[PDB]
Design a protein around this ligand. Structure first.
Ligand SMILES: *[C@@H]1O[C@H](CO)[C@@H](O[C@@H]2O[C@H](CO)[C@@H](O)[C@H](O)[C@H]2NC(C)=O)[C@H](O)[C@H]1NC(C)=O
Lengths: 49, 49
């Protein structure tokens, strides 16, 4: 007896259903660094406000 | 003849006399802007001008 599971996922990407972001990194401050907080990208320094 | 209005007065910052001192405050719209040691907006704590 071998247990088997069949997996099928659709396509065409219009009903975005599962996806996955993962890959969360650390934080630094008062240094020049590229930032990609939530999809937006840029270069600069991070401090308080 | 009386000329104290236009003659400079030492008892005042710089040597600005009364007439042009009064005229100077009339503009007060550009707020100089001749890089008065800019870069101080490193942390935009104020309304960032
Ligand atoms: C020339 O005009 C000035 C205007 O500023 C006169 O200064 C006034 O002098 C009187 C009395 O000396 C004071 O009460 C006023 O306060 C002064 N004006 C200001 C704006 O402070 C000055 O006296 C005039 N010169 C002469 C010879 O009278």
């Amino acid at each position: 007896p071998y247990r088997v599971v069949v997996l099928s996922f659709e396509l065409l990407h219009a009903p975005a259903t599962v996806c996955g972001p993962k890959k969360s990194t650390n934080l630094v401050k008062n240094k020049c660094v590229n930032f990609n907080f939530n999809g937006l990208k840029g270069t600069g320094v991070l401090t308080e406000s | 003849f009386n000329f104290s209005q236009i003659l400079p007065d030492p008892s005042k910052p710089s040597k600005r006399s009364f007439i042009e001192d009064l005229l100077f405050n009339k503009v007060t719209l550009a707020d100089a802007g001749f890089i008065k040691q800019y870069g101080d907006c490193l942390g935009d704590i104020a309304a960032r001008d």
